[PDB]
Design a protein around this ligand. Structure first.
Ligand SMILES: CCCCCCCC/C=C\CCCCCCCC(=O)OC[C@H](O)CO
Ligand SMILES: CCCCCCCC/C=C\CCCCCCCC(=O)OC[C@H](O)CO
Ligand SMILES: *C\C=C(C)/C=C/C=C(C)/C=C/C1=C(C)CCCC1(C)C
Ligand SMILES: CCCCCCCC/C=C\CCCCCCCC(=O)O
Ligand SMILES: CCCCCCCC/C=C\CCCCCCCC(=O)O
Ligand SMILES: CCCCCCCC/C=C\CCCCCCCC(=O)O
Ligand SMILES: CCCCCCCC/C=C\CCCCCCCC(=O)O
Ligand SMILES: CCCCCCCC/C=C\CCCCCCCC(=O)O
Ligand SMILES: [Cl-]
Length: 258
């Protein structure tokens, strides 16, 4: 059902896909430590933002590690190529970590934006529902990336309607609330939004690889696209978020941050 099941892979394609997944594990658990240590230097207000970054690091690192073992459990090097043995690998388990990390990524954005009370719970409910609708409709489409490519596009179309609306809600809250942020972070948050528009858009590109590159090098490209998009949406993003949390904690008079 996923194009990965359709192809044999050379030794170089297979251990490259393997090396991308194990490397992502190391990067995510290496940033987990960093997000853990620096949390003390964040005021109680924004401290949850760094904990969320710790959550997504482990959430992603566990799925990447799981994708790696499954990758090496499903294929066997036979007669000069790694051939599918049993059916254990699938991208579907990437969509199940998005359901969890995306709300965490989104929640820590509203926290640094200094939203609170009725607006925090309200804005968070519409963003998560929009996200979940985006991920769910996207999961239904990739189920046909091999069988029905027409269903892939229309489900990706419905998923894009949610993606666009979600971005519009994030962008609107960003520009209407940055004047409240401290330490000059009103300039930094804008760039994070642009970083967001960039890293998040790589996923639909990877989602469409089966449509314009249906072969073994397309599977390699998709993982590469995932890896690049996955470090920028979670690691770099979480790094930009922590800096803002620290900076505002200093401007607000929190010594450990100062
Ligand atoms: C069936 C598929 C419909 C898909 C998209 C349209 C629905 C999107 C409806 C979202 C409107 C509510 C909203 O977005 O409000 C956010 C507000 O800015 C928070 O303060
Ligand atoms: C649609 C893609 C996301 C659009 C981001 C820009 C936006 O949402 O608009 C912000 C607001 O209109 C500025 O005052
Ligand atoms: C790991 C972090 C994130 C933010 C994953 C994000 C995924 C998307 C933004 C996926 C979007 C899709 C769209 C817009 C339409 C095609 C199907 C996708 C689910 C890949
Ligand atoms: C203070 C140092 C912090 C260390 C950060 C790096 C942590 C990485 C931990 C282990 C990475 C390897 C796990 C993946 C196992 C191989 C996957 C496989 O091919 O089956
Ligand atoms: C059912 C899913 C949609 C519901 C919306 C979720 C609302 C998220 C609200 C907060 C989650 C956990 C606490 C984080 C807020 C910190 C408050 C603070 O530090 O001032
Ligand atoms: C327990 C909460 C889990 C997430 C579900 C709630 C989020 C609702 C989001 C939008 C509804 C879109 C559902 C459409 C699914 C159609 C695909 C199908 O059923 O075949
Ligand atoms: C996902 C983004 C939306 C992609 C564009 C929507 C699909 C229209 C493209 C062309 C349809 C041709 C069908 C022939 C197979
Ligand atoms: C989100 C709620 C559902 C959104 C759009 C409904 C149309 C989506 C396609 C329906 C099933 C397509 C099919 O399998 O024939
Ligand atoms: Cl990912």
């Amino acid at each position: 059902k996923n194009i990965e099941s359709l192809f044999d892979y050379s030794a170089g394609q297979f251990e490259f896909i393997d090396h991308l997944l194990t490397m992502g594990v190391g990067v995510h658990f290496a940033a987990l430590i960093f997000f853990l240590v620096v949390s003390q230097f964040v005021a109680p207000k924004y401290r949850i933002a760094t904990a969320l970054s710790c959550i997504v690091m482990v959430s992603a690192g566990l799925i990447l590690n799981s994708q790696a073992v499954m990758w090496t459990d499903a294929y066997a090097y036979v007669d000069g190529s790694y051939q599918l043995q049993d059916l254990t690998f699938s991208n579907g388990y990437r969509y199940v970590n998005w359901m969890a990390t995306i709300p965490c990524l989104l929640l820590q954005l509203l926290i640094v934006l200094n939203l609170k009370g009725k607006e925090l719970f309200s804005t968070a409910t519409w963003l998560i529902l929009a996200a979940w609708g985006m991920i769910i409709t996207g999961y239904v489409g990739q189920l046909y990336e091999v069988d029905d490519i027409a269903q892939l596009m229309i489900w990706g179309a419905v998923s894009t309607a949610f993606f666009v609306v979600m971005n519009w809600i994030v962008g609107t809250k960003i520009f209407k609330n940055r004047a409240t942020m401290l330490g000059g972070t009103d300039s930094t948050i804008t760039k994070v939004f642009w970083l967001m528009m960039f890293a998040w858009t790589l996923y639909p590109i990877a989602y469409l690889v089966p449509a314009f590159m249906n072969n073994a090098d397309g599977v390699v490209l998709r993982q590469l696209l995932f890896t690049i998009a996955d470090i920028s949406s979670k690691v770099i993003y979480g790094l930009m978020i922590t800096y803002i949390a620290i900076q505002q904690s200093a401007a607000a008079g929190y010594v450990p941050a100062q």
